[PDB]
Design a protein around this ligand. Structure first.
Ligand SMILES: [Zn+2]
Lengths: 5, 961
């Protein structure tokens, strides 16, 4: 997953 | 023309689907402002974000700006009463919170739409003339101490702080933001500091209008909102404070190529890989770090994670950019570790570097950028209408970063392809710039450093030049491929016309042995989205601890095998939730309706034809055993809640029964359970959104047909549609269950005053009483008595039954917490006797507004319907009906309800208490300025949950509407 949130 | 306004922005760019109207402006004193007019809204809202936080604390008073955040709520010159602000919000259907980060202090509220000015007038004074009263300063420091105490044994907070402790100790980044009683009272007293003056100095120094941004959302016209904000905020004084800036990275040369070995509280195993980077915030139109985060954090075929998971080294991966402050950021790649992965950390990191090398070799891909941009443009156009309170808070923070005209779009719309920035950031992701942290219980006794705020045990080591050199020579690995075109990207956004037979509530459009289908075509939001919710009933999901484990494991294994294929859908705005329940399984599919039947068909088909990979089985079984064990490290109040559920529900397997049955879960046994689970089902569904009756009937029948085809599924009997009951407590009884939390050195308590089965009258008696005592008992049990940071009261609803609960976490023993709650309740009877009828009617009105508040987006409306469906009450019009009844109630009615069900000598009092003792309260007694606590009876102490349950009746279940 992309670092977020 | 208007001296108080420096400028009005041009048109604020919004989604064409957004009916709210917007005006940006800057006041003469420098405050950046967004006004949001929504003539439909039920709750109005405002937020103010000051561009100062923790990183600006004095080095000698750690946590000051966070303490100051607490203090602002506790009275101002215009409105000196300590809870005037919170009382007024509570009496007008509002709520408020605030937070402090390294660079921002953000304060926000919502309120009934007719009381915006009243709420905002009080709020505005926080920024003008706080009192910082000496007596509430002395009390409120305990709340902040108690906020820190709950975080101490939390792995994420310990790691957040350990990072800061291992960078340059001279950088503001190393500061402890939270503060505690030591940093905020004890040490300042020792050092002769007057904390009241320090709060006043810090507020005076940094609460300057030039660092503030304000957002207001109301029913009022944009001109009326404009006059309001001018009226209230143009008196904030401009001290022209320079914006703090941190151009020097906290991680300098000597902090790079370092390895940390850290002992966690929970039995967890993780690897954290960090590279310092420049601040990329100014590049938001191209966003090079997001582009790289998308690629490196990808989970589809060809990805970094696919290879690490195939090797059996890792199960999940996060990557991409991470905020630091104005002047610095981080780029991370974090993974959890299997037991094998733990022994292969060097290889994991080499694979990371080979994947990064692959990105260098292929070069920046405009088609990837273009996909990101296309997805962001669709997400922006069709974004769900936000709740006002979170919306104003979020826009207040970002008004500091973007031109007025761009505040709504700036975070979504990508404009510029920047292969030069992408290479530049990629050039930072090199082994010479790396920090590596490994978290594992294996390091216990092998560490020689202690972080001072949390007690974290760790060891630091230079990474050997040999290891670095090997990472530097990472070449291409044939396993790593860029993703291909995302085919889940939606292209059909047509809004089907409203059918002639469309209903305001879901309609039962199918009622068969196999399935019950509730359906509503969206008549409100008109976005191309739908929610497809399915409850699968099967008595085999919970028949015993072993089956319950197997249900869980089956669904985790399914989600794990689907993950590569579902990740594309999830980037494309189509997600799903799949979990085992005490009744069977729950499935939800949400997002763009376009490709949604495809993902759904794939899930059912995979479920019904599932083949377990034995290696994935063993890894996920080991994670699940640790997950069951790790509950011991949850918070005392979470323990109190968990035990009450176990006590009050007819059937409930404990974590210990689950973990003991887990050794008996074998592959052969799981393989046999699955066809058994699926052999007989009942399906209750809600299909709600941009969909027709016939598409709904078709999706429903497709799901049944797939289960019938591959799993030979047959319907359940109506009589096997078994709901569990709540234990029925005896008139005048008081039972106590006691346990110890072996990790945290606080107590938790949950007190439950069970009333009776849910119905129109019982619901609203309870909810009104709650409304009335809600702010007072926060005010009493926290603000005045400072029993803890976590102080909760409100209805408890389970299994068709209800009652009043209190949840507190504290350093004080549970028997003590109990006397204080009992003292509180007497205060509330006197207070209800003493309150005017108009004060009484404002509470009815506040509860009314809360209950009638309209969903702003599809999924909030679905959730309401779904609560009716899964409770089997099917009361879709409950809100109008309950509210009409509520307005009938009198002061006399609530006094009588209290006296009959709630008072200490109430004839129908049914009290159960869960006492969770702090790590260090050894054993302990169950019984034992300040208002006077009544004498309590001797409780019956619960020794055995099974016996307790056997010895009591069970309630009926609520009848369906
Ligand atoms: Zn706080």
């Amino acid at each position: 997953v992309v670092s977020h949130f | 023309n208007n001296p108080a306004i420096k400028r009005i922005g041009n048109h604020i760019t919004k989604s064409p689907e957004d009916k709210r109207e917007y005006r940006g402006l800057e006041l003469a004193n420098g405050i950046k402002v967004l006004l949001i007019s929504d003539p439909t809204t039920d709750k109005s809202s405002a937020a103010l974000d000051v561009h100062i936080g923790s990183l600006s604390d004095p080095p000698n008073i750690a946590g000051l700006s966070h303490f100051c955040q607490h203090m602002l709520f506790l009275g101002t010159k215009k409105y000196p009463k300590e809870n005037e602000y919170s009382q007024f919000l509570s009496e007008h259907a509002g709520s408020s919170n605030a937070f402090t980060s390294g660079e921002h202090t953000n304060y926000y509220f919502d309120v009934s739409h007719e009381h915006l000015e009243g709420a905002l007038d009080r709020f505005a004074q926080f920024f003008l003339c706080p009192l910082f009263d000496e007596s509430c300063k002395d009390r409120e420091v305990n709340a902040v101490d108690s906020e820190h105490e709950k975080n101490v044994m939390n792995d994420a907070w310990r790691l957040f702080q350990l990072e800061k402790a291992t960078g340059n100790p001279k950088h503001p980044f190393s500061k402890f933001g939270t503060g505690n009683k030591y940093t905020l009272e004890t040490r300042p007293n020792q050092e002769g500091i007057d904390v009241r003056q320090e709060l006043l100095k810090f507020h005076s120094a940094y609460y300057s209008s030039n660092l503030m941004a304000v957002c207001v959302l109301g029913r009022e016209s944009l001109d009326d909102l404009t006059n309001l904000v001018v009226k209230l905020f143009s008196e904030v004084e401009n001290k022209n404070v320079p914006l703090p800036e941190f151009p020097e990275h906290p991680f300098q040369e000597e902090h790079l190529k370092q390895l940390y070995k850290i002992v966690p509280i929970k039995d967890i195993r993780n690897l954290y890989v960090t590279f310092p980077i420049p601040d990329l915030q100014k590049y938001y139109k191209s966003n090079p770090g997001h582009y790289l985060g998308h690629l490196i954090g990808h989970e589809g075929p060809g990805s970094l994670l696919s290879e690490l998971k195939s090797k059996g080294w890792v199960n999940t991966l996060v990557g991409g950019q991470k905020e630091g402050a104005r002047g610095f950021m981080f780029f991370i790649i974090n993974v959890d570790l299997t037991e094998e992965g733990l022994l292969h950390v060097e290889d994991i990191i080499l694979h990371m570097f080979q994947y990064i090398q692959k990105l260098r070799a292929e070069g920046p891909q405009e088609w990837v950028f273009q996909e990101c941009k296309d997805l962001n443009a669709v997400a922006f156009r069709f974004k769900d209408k936000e709740r006002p309170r979170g919306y104003t808070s979020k826009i207040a923070g970002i008004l500091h970063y973007y031109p007025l005209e761009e505040v709504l779009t700036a975070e979504y719309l990508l404009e510029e392809f920047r292969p030069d920035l992408i290479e530049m950031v990629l050039d930072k992701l090199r082994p010479e710039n790396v920090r590596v942290a490994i978290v594992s219980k294996s390091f216990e006794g092998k560490t020689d450093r202690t972080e001072e705020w949390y007690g974290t045990q760790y060891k630091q080591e230079a990474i050997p030049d040999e290891v670095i050199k090997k990472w530097q020579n990472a070449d291409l690995n044939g396993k790593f491929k860029l993703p291909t075109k995302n085919e889940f990207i939606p292209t059909n956004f047509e809004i089907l016309p409203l059918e002639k037979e469309a209903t305001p509530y879901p309609a039962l459009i199918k009622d068969t042995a196999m399935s019950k289908l509730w359906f509503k075509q969206d008549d409100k939001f008109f976005l191309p989205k739908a929610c497809l919710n399915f409850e699968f009933f099967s008595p085999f999901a919970y028949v015993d601890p072993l089956h319950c484990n197997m249900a869980y494991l089956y669904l985790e294994l399914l989600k794990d095998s689907l993950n590569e294929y579902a990740y594309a859908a999830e980037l494309a705005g189509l997600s799903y939730d799949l979990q085992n329940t005490i009744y069977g399984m729950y499935l939800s599919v949400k997002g763009y309706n376009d490709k949604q039947p495809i993902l759904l068909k794939k899930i059912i088909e995979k479920m019904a034809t599932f083949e377990i990979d034995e290696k994935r089985f063993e890894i996920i079984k080991e994670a699940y055993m640790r997950s069951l064990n790790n509950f011991r490290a949850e918070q005392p109040h979470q323990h109190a809640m968990y035990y009450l559920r176990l006590l009050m529900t007819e059937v409930a397997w404990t974590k210990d029964e689950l973990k003991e049955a887990l050794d008996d879960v074998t592959l052969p046994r799981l393989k046999a359970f699955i066809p058994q689970l699926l052999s007989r089902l009942h399906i209750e569904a809600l299909l709600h959104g941009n969909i027709t009756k016939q598409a709904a009937l078709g999706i429903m029948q497709m799901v049944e047909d797939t289960l019938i085809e591959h799993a030979h599924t047959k319907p359940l009997l109506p009589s096997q549609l078994v709901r569990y009951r709540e234990v029925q407590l005896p008139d005048r009884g008081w039972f106590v269950y006691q346990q110890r939390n072996e990790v945290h050195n606080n107590c938790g308590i949950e007190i439950y005053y069970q009333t009776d089965m849910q119905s129109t009258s019982e619901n609203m008696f309870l909810e009104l009483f709650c409304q009335i005592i809600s702010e007072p008992c926060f005010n009493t049990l926290r603000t005045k008595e400072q029993l803890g940071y976590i102080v909760f009261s409100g209805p408890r609803r389970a299994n068709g039954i209800q009652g009043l609960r209190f949840i507190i976490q504290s350093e004080k023993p549970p028997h003590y917490l109990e006397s204080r709650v009992e003292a509180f309740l007497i205060t509330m009877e006197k207070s209800i006797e003493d309150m005017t009828e108009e004060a009484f009617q404002k509470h009815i009105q506040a509860l009314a507004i809360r209950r009638l508040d309209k969903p702003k987006k599809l999924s909030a409306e679905c959730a309401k319907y779904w609560g009716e469906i899964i409770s089997q009450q099917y009361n879709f019009d409950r809100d109008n009906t309950e509210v009409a009844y509520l307005k009938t109630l009198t002061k006399e009615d609530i006094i009588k309800f209290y006296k009959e069900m709630l008072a200490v000598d109430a004839p129908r009092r049914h009290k159960v208490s869960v006492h969770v003792l702090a790590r260090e309260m050894d054993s302990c007694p169950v019984v034992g300025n300040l208002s006077q606590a009544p004498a309590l009876p001797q409780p019956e102490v619960i020794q055995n949950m099974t016996e307790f349950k056997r010895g009591l009746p069970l309630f009926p279940l609520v009848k369906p509407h």
